[PDB]
Write a protein that binds this ligand. Structure first.
Ligand SMILES: CN1CCN(CCC(=O)Nc2ccc3ncnc(Nc4ccc(NC(=O)Nc5cc(C(C)(C)C)nn5-c5cccc(N)c5)cc4)c3c2)CC1
Length: 261
């Protein structure tokens, strides 16, 4: 009934990318030419209206650094069609064969992109609630886009959010700080060696992750600003974007490439 609808013959489902509890994820082709990602709803598992809220949100939030909705099939069996990002989630990308080649100039640039996407979320007064590398999609030429696989993650979650349910754009900023450690460690789990119960407490006592090996101190300092006890004292995404884009001229103009970063 809307301009997003497509015939069912428009979609070729080519390669299965993952199975969930409510359906599947496929790489495929829309209109014989456009490479596409296809999200499946297994009937009976979830309200059609519930599954289609994903598309409704993706219609309202459009930006070059947010995952793009292409089309829907809104009658059961339902299909949600989005743009195909050829490198998968950032986490897998960072951990995989491409890990070793990425250095700080690339990693900061990816950060700048994510920040930009999140700066749009900021302008829209939306909250992500689960920003981290597993929810970032990577495409050609290191293009990064904010996304949500919808599939707890206290290690990435701001204390006030984890404890008191206070999820804001500022608990997103905290998460972005943790995202920065994922970028600088090539995808390792944050707070290595600590279980979930060890993180929540120590963070409340004021523990913050130390500067990762080879990371410039100015970048760790930026993480620390994202990790301030007081949500309102955390920097805006607009600020994070600008800082990251200008990093190699204004902040670290003497940066020398090392072993890993
Ligand atoms: C060891 N491996 C083994 C297998 N690997 C996984 C394999 C894999 O999956 N590959 C792959 C490769 C290329 C892919 N290319 C594209 N998409 C993929 N998927 C993809 C499809 C759709 C979406 N949807 C959204 O992002 N939605 C969305 C955006 C947003 C905003 C606007 C950000 C807020 N909000 N919501 C939103 C709103 C409401 C409800 C919900 N639930 C969400 C996300 C990702 C791909 C997936 C993992 C570990």
């Amino acid at each position: 009934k809307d301009a997003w609808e497509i015939p069912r013959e428009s979609l070729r489902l080519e390669v299965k990318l993952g199975q969930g509890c409510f359906g599947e994820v496929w790489m495929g082709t829309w209109n014989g030419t456009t490479r596409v990602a296809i999200k499946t709803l297994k009937p009976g598992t979830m309200s059609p209206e519930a599954f289609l809220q994903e598309a409704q949100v993706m219609k309202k939030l459009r930006h070059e650094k947010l995952v793009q909705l292409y089309a829907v099939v809104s009658e059961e069996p339902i299909y949600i069609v989005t743009e195909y990002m050829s490198k998968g989630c950032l986490l897998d990308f960072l951990k995989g064969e491409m890990g070793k080649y990425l250095r700080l100039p690339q990693l900061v640039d990816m950060a700048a992109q994510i920040a930009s996407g999140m700066a749009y979320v900021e302008r829209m007064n939306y909250v992500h609630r689960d920003l981290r590398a597993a929810n970032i999609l990577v495409g050609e030429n290191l293009v990064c886009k904010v996304a949500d696989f919808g599939l707890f993650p206290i290690k990435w979650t701001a204390p006030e959010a984890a404890l008191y349910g206070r999820f804001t754009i500022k608990s997103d900023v905290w998460s972005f700080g943790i995202l920065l450690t994922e970028l600088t460690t090539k995808g390792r789990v944050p707070y290595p060696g600590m279980v979930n119960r060890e993180v929540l407490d120590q963070v409340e006592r004021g523990y913050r992750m130390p500067c990762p090996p080879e990371c410039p101190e100015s970048l760790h300092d930026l993480m620390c600003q994202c990790w301030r006890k007081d949500p309102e004292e955390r920097p805006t995404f607009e600020y994070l974007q600008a800082f990251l884009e200008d990093y190699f001229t204004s902040t670290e103009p003497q940066y020398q490439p090392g072993e890993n970063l």
